[PDB]
């Protein structure tokens, strides 16, 4: 929350 | 309602 | 208990009705598409002006009143295509879907949101004219027959040294070439031309790089592109889905990390946290449809396509 | 088209 966000979007592997 | 996705189709993964 | 007054406008209809205060985005969306008889719903969304006057997509998995919609009455929404197919011929099956895309795309071209060179503008106008007027008829379509219409981008009219009669002649000759074309086929031909434009189906975001230099991100059906600040046509760098291992988001930063580990990471910044979040969401949506259109058609789609060529 | 719940 507030200013703070983190997220790793990993695309599908073959 | 119980629609869980942000657009009008399901997201996989 | 229907106490929230809404107005939803599509490219050619206006709906005014009330919703319950607990209505989710999806429920509002479902009522609109049922009312208009649209079945190819996956492309579409509801846009609204937030309190600061930024255009925002309604999240269908949250209540309407829980989202940053304004405090006016009625609440105002635009029903618009949000996601674009990779090929209109293969993927826009029904006449309504084709028409909604046609009108939206045409509005963008005529408003100079989507760049079009003059020759393309003229060809597009000729198909719009065939759709509107049907066949060119020398008996009826006298000199000046196009004089009322908005047919070309103002930039094309500003920048050039033709007058408006000369512009009509430019369009007329191609109108005459389309004699015999069904009005609906003219709309499809319009979209076939438009979908090859550099700006077509591109969502642009103002970003900066790690030195603070201004650029644009474009997000589209095939991936991400980075543009020079002064050129939204030709990508500086392209990132098709297949080349992306992950995108790592951290506050306002996003980092595109390649499949090729012998390639470098690319770091950019969105101006606001909310914008970075919007970038992720639109990437995820596009990538989902990318995967979906490469799988075999659903039963529903197989039937719509059969029903459609039955109607010939 | 115009629809209203009037």
Curated annotation (Swiss-Prot), chain C:
Activity regulation as described: A head-to-tail association, of the N-terminal and C-terminal halves results in a closed conformation (inactive form) which is incapable of actin or membrane-binding.
Residues with PTM S-nitrosocysteine: 116
Motif [IL]-x-C-x-x-[DE] motif positions after renumbering to this chain: 114-119
Residue ranges of every copy of the FERM domain listed in the record: 1-294
Main localization category: membrane
Protein's UniProt keywords contain Hydrolase: no
Residues recorded as bearing Phosphotyrosine in the entry: 115
Tissue expression per record: In all tissues and cultured cells studied.
In-chain residues carrying the UniProt-annotated modification N6-succinyllysine: 82
Cellular compartments per GO CC: adherens junction; apical part of cell; apical plasma membrane; basolateral plasma membrane; blood microparticle; cell periphery; cell surface; cytoplasm
Post-translational modification: Phosphorylation by ROCK2 suppresses the head-to-tail association of the N-terminal and C-terminal halves resulting in an opened conformation which is capable of actin and membrane-binding. S-nitrosylation of Cys-116 is induced by interferon-gamma and oxidatively-modified low-densitity lipoprotein (LDL(ox)) implicating the iNOS-S100A8/9 transnitrosylase complex.
Outcome of swapping residue 119 to M: Inhibits S-nitrosylation of Cys-116
Subunit structure, interactors included: In resting T-cells, part of a PAG1-NHERF1-MSN complex which is disrupted upon TCR activation. Interacts with NHERF1. Interacts with PPP1R16B. Interacts with SELPLG and SYK; these interactions mediate the activation of SYK by SELPLG. Interacts with PDPN (via cytoplasmic domain); this interaction activates RHOA and promotes epithelial-mesenchymal transition. Interacts with SPN/CD43 cytoplasmic tail. Interacts with CD44. Interacts with ICAM2. Interacts with ICAM3 (via C-terminus). Interacts with PDZD8. Interacts with F-actin. Interacts with CD46. Interacts with PTPN6.
Name the UniProt record assigns to this protein: Moesin
Source organism of this protein record: Homo sapiens (Human)
Gene this chain is encoded by: MSN
Shown chain mapped onto the complete sequence: 2 to 313 of 577
């Amino acid at each position: 929350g507030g200013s703070s966000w983190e997220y790793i979007w990993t695309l599908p592997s073959g | 309602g119980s629609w869980k996705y942000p657009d009008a189709f399901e997201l996989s993964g | 208990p229907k106490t929230i007054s809404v107005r939803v406008t599509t490219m050619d209809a206006e709906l005014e009705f009330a919703i319950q205060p607990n209505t989710t985005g999806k429920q509002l969306f479902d009522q609109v598409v049922k009312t208009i008889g649209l079945r190819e719903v996956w492309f579409f969304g509801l846009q609204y002006q937030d309190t600061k006057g930024f255009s925002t997509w309604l999240k269908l998995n949250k209540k309407v009143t829980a989202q940053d919609v304004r405090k006016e009455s009625p609440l105002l929404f635009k029903f618009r295509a949000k996601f674009y197919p990779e090929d209109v011929s293969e993927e826009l099956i029904q006449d309504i879907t084709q028409r909604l895309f046609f009108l939206q795309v045409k509005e963008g071209i005529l408003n100079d949101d989507i760049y079009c060179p003059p020759e393309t503008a003229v060809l597009l106008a000729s198909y719009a004219v065939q759709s509107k007027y049907g066949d060119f008829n020398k008996e009826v379509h006298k000199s000046g027959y196009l004089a009322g219409d908005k047919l070309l981008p103002q930039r094309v009219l500003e920048q050039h040294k033709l007058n408006k009669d000369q512009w009509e002649e430019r369009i007329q000759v191609w109108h005459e070439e389309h004699r015999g074309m069904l009005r609906e086929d003219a709309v499809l031909e319009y979209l076939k031309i438009a979908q090859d434009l550099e700006m077509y189906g591109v969502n642009y975001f103002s970003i900066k790089n790690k030195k603070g230099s201004e650029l644009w991100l474009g997000v589209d059906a095939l991936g991400l592109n980075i543009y020079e600040q002064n050129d939204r046509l030709t990508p500086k760098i392209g990132f098709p889905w297949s080349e992306i291992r992950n995108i790592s988001f951290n506050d306002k930063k996003f980092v595109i990390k390649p499949i090729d580990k012998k390639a470098p990471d690319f770091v950019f910044y969105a101006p606001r946290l909310r914008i970075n979040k919007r970038i992720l969401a639109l990437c995820m949506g596009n990538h989902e449809l990318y995967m979906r259109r490469r799988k075999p058609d659903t039963i529903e789609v197989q039937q719509m396509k059969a029903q459609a060529r039955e109607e010939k | 088209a115009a629809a209203a719940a009037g």
